[PDB]
């Protein structure tokens, strides 16, 4: 027989991590692996139909994606849906697939609103989620002995679908659910300048441990403002939630990184300012299979899509799709091994959830809620040469923290600053 896979991704724009120009080679490699493996769907072939989720302007919209999904469902009636990645585009599509009892597979859409299975049933997320970042924050708080208060700041920028809103809300809800501590939050505009002054005036009265969701340039400007104001690392600590590693170019294998220098004439001050800043990023795979997959992915993408891919953690986004696709196929086989049909949905989704799988990224696990557990990394600056390096990794499967080559997380004073000063705010 034939198995139909429906893809709803931007087929023209090549600026999103889930763009077709970067996902298509991964899907082709997954299909080739499935064909070369007699264990996965013997005697069956897999097809693929494509649809656009962008308007005439070329950005993902919440109007074109549901229409494309409806048209694909009416014309082809597929068994599974791939994508989209944008939350506003994916939510109506997810609801439509839940109503149609058609399984949905995605690696994007990490908003907390997808965490309820009563509404978004039969939906699997094989990519990173914002709740695992909350788990990492809770684990770090437990390890470092902070139990009283925290502060959260996020920046607003026109043009994107509120990237720093969903992450902050998900992390904040997860921290409240798991740690039971008093947490604050605030939004600021990075385009304005008086907003920075107001932030530096109001931060000392609201807490000492601060998480920031903004651009690397905004983070550097804020750090310089804090340094000139009088803020020091002996009382304050700053965390930057750069998941994809933009301040540190790529976030790839070991190499000296200096994010505080750009030749603006004030690198000396920025080097001293960055002594109180740490970065939280994703964890890159280490096995050589990931490197081979990256090589083949880049080669095939260059030859077949006229696109030149770079090195970075963004490449971890399409690969997950690949792995997820493989997992789905396995589940289907199990259904076909138990006297079922490929048009059930519930059995396949239940078999996928709470399972351990092996892929190019490594050994992944899907819990009972159908959310892949992700590992995290914490970067720290070398006190000798002033270069950032990886010092701590967090495994979400066992929920554990491990150092790298015996590296010690240094502090300006000697031990982490207290969460609340003895004199209070």
């Amino acid at each position, epitope marked *: *027989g034939n198995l139909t896979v429906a893809v709803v991704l931007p087929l023209a724009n090549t600026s999103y991590p889930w763009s077709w120009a970067r996902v298509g080679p991964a899907v082709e490699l997954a299909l080739a692996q499935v064909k070369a493996r007699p264990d996965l769907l013997p005697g*069956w072939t897999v097809r693929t139909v494509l649809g656009s989720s962008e308007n005439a302007l070329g950005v993902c919209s919440d109007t074109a994606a549901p229409l494309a999904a409806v048209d694909l469902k009416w*014309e082809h*009636n597929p068994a599974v849906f791939l994508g989209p990645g944008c939350v506003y585009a994916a939510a109506p599509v997810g609801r439509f697939t839940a109503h149609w009892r058609v399984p949905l597979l995605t690696a994007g859409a990490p908003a907390l609103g997808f965490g309820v299975k009563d509404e978004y049933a039969l939906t699997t997320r094989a990519g990173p989620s914002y709740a695992k970042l909350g788990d990492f924050v809770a684990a770090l708080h437990r390890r470092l002995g902070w139990e009283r208060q925290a502060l959260m700041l996020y920046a607003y920028r026109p043009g994107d679908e509120e990237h720093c809103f969903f992450l902050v809300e998900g992390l904040f809800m997860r921290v409240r659910d798991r740690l039971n501590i008093t947490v604050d939050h605030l939004e600021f505009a990075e385009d304005d300048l008086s907003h920075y002054t107001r932030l530096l005036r109001t931060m000392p009265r609201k807490g000492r441990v601060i998480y920031i969701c903004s651009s690397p340039d905004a983070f550097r400007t804020l750090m310089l403002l804090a340094l000139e104001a009088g803020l020091c690392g002996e009382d304050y600590v700053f965390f930057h939630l750069d998941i994809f590693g933009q301040s540190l170019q790529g976030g790839q294998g070991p190499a000296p990184r200096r994010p505080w220098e750009r030749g603006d004439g004030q690198d000396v001050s920025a080097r001293q300012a960055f002594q109180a800043a740490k970065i939280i990023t994703y964890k890159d795979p280490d096995n050589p299979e990931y490197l081979e997959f990256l090589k083949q992915l880049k080669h095939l993408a260059y030859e077949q899509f006229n696109f030149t891919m770079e090195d970075g953690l963004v490449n971890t986004i399409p690969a997950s799709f690949h792995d997820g696709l493989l997992l789905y196929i396995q589940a289907v086989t199990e259904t076909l*091994a138990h*006297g*079922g*049909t490929v*048009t059930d949905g519930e059995n396949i989704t239940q078999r996928m959830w709470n399972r351990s799988f092996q892929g190019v990224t490594g050994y992944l696990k899907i819990d009972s809620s159908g959310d892949r557990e992700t590992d995290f990394s914490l970067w720290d600056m070398d006190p000798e040469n002033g270069a950032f390096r990886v010092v701590l990794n967090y495994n979400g499967t066992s929920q554990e923290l491990v150092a790298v080559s015996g590296r010690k997380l240094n502090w300006p004073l000697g031990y982490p600053p207290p969460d609340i000063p003895k004199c209070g705010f």
Partner: antibody
Amino acid sequence: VQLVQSGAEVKKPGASVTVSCKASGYTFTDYYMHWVRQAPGQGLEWMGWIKPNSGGTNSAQRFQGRITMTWDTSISTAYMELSRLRSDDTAVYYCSRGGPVMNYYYYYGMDVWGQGTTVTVSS
Amino acid sequence: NIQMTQSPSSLSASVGDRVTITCRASQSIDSYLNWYQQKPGKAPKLLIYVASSLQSGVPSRFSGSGSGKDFTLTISSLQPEDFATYYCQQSYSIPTFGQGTRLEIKR
């Protein structure tokens, strides 16, 4: 390839009925087994099917409540048990084989059919 | 589920004529369709196994075609033994049977 059925009993509503289907002449554990019922004047009506080698079963939403299908590979026989019979269960039953099990070709049509058995429910 | 419709409900034709029957599905099915013929007092017998295959032991005068939501069954030349009730069944999902199509002679 042969398919032998036996039974024409009539009984009061609320009792149970058992239908046996014999599939001698071919490898019983190499094909699916479909049970299908047809009303006297309505038309054909798919009931369910079983897969012997993997021990799998599939039934309709409106029939899964009170039907039980089993098999015996020693003599290559299939048994269908229906309970909570009402006045709407007076019909003709057929057992058929179709679709190999080495490859999951469950969409193959039913090749060999049975003679059929008549079940009447009345007090 | 998928509801299946047959056209026409009844048709009268003579011997040696061209006859077509149309089966329509409420949802799109690629090639999952089977055709069965049934005579009174006898079990159904299979004729076409995909939308366009041809089961062993079937005369070549029967043909099947179509795809998507519409399929056609064609008999090039009717014979006195070709008058029976025809059913089109879908196998992509939980199988369902059509209402039937009775064929009779012309008088």
